[PDB]
Amino acid sequence: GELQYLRQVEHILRCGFKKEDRTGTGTLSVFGMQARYSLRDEFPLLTTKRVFWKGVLEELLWFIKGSTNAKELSSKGVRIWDANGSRDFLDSLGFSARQEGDLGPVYGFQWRHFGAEYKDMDSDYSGQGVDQLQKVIDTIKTNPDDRRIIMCAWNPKDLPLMALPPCHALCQFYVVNGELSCQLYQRSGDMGLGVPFNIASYALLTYMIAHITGLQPGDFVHTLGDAHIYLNHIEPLKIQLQREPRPFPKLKILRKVETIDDFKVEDFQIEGYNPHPT
């Protein structure tokens, strides 16, 4: 399973093109890649380098409750978003009137309130917009054959208000033989840092919705747009390709949860996770 992520890193090193980027540092880049990670009795937390699993779980819980407030997640000891909610960064984009921590209408707003008129991170959006997360869950229960089970965070109208455009433009869910699968469209992926994390996020989400829907986790299909490696991270990765992968951990949910909103941190345990050091 992890071989696919390794083979993808190798491919970019062996066939990617040099491509400048917004940061001016430069990458090796391939456009268009796809990998399928089984979720059947294992969880694809990568072993050839440690993934910040606390961040994955708490960020997803943050997403689910609809929050666009970087402080709400920082208080969990996960600071991924803090720099994009900083005062100077928000002023850098003309959001002087904004409060620090207000990320705009990012994933939380889009997943729970798509199409609603955003104001600030403290506003009350109850009943406003499309609750895509719950629509997906209802459709899985009532019509698992549906080929439109999509959750879309890419919102062209809200893009100017987001602190940064979402990398995870949309995901699609699928059911056959009582198995729940998920395909992520990730428009831009840093193989050295973001991507192993993002694989965890959406595999976790698939586990959660399969639990709520009475289904088994199936496959997680990861589809990349610009899949890249920053030039200054080539040497760490070449070392990492050398390290042989140890079997994927497993994920256990310690109690029968009924709604996606009822999940909490202590309902999840990663057992068997032996990553290589870095």
Ligand X SMILES: O=c1ccn([C@H]2C[C@H](O)[C@@H](COP(=O)(O)O)O2)c(=O)[nH]1
Residues marked active site are found at 167
- 165, two tokens: 């455009």
Per rule CB under 6 A, is residue 148 in the interface with ligand X? yes
Question: Using CB distances below 5 to 8 A depending on partner kind, what does residue 43 bind out of ligand X, ligand 08D, its own copies, none?
Answer: none
Q: Is 224 exposed, middle or buried (0-12, 13-18, 19+ CB in 10 A)?
A: buried
Instruction: Give Cα 123 to chain centroid, integer Å.
Output: 25
C-beta atoms surrounding 174 within 10 Å: 18
Binding to ligand 08D (CB under 6 A) within 54-113 occurs at 55, 80-81, 84
Nearer to ligand 08D, 79 or 238 (CB): 79
Binding to its own copies (CB under 8 A) within 114-153 occurs at 114-115, 129-130, 132, 135, 145-148, 150, 152
From 67, 69, 110, 188, residue interacting with ligand X (rule: CB under 6 A): 188
Rg (CA), the chain: 19
Strand-pair partners of 107 = none
Sole residue written with tokens 């229960």: 141
In this chain, which residue has its C-beta nearest to ligand 08D?
194
Sole residue written with tokens 């996770």: 273
Contacts with ligand 08D, 177-206, as mask; x by CB under 6 A: -------------x--xx--x---------
Contacts with ligand 08D, 125-164, as mask; x by CB under 6 A: ---------------------------------------x
Nearer to its own copies, 77 or 156 (CB): 156
- In angstroms, the CA 32 to CA 45 distance is 22
CA distances for 221 relative to 47, 160, 232, angstroms? 19, 29, 28
3-state secondary structure of 257: coil
From 47, 67, 139, 223, residue interacting with its own copies (rule: CB under 8 A): 223
- 195, two tokens: 């991507």
- 248, two tokens: 């994927």
- In angstroms, the CA 94 to CA 278 distance is 38
Name residues whose C-beta falls within 8 Å of residue 7's C-beta, 6 or more positions apart in sequence: none
Q: Is the sign of the CA dihedral 217, 7, 168, 85 positive or negative? A: positive
List residues forming the annotated binding site: 22, 147-148, 167-168, 187-190, 198, 228-230
* Binding region for ligand X (CB under 6 A): 21-22, 147-148, 165, 167, 188-190, 194-195, 198
* Binding region for ligand 08D (CB under 6 A): 52, 55, 80-81, 84, 164, 190, 193-194, 197
* Binding region for its own copies (CB under 8 A): 17, 19-22, 29, 31-34, 36, 114-115, 129-130, 132, 135, 145-148, 150, 152, 154, 156-157, 165, 169-170, 172, 174, 176-177, 181, 183, 185, 187-188, 218-219, 221, 223, 225-226
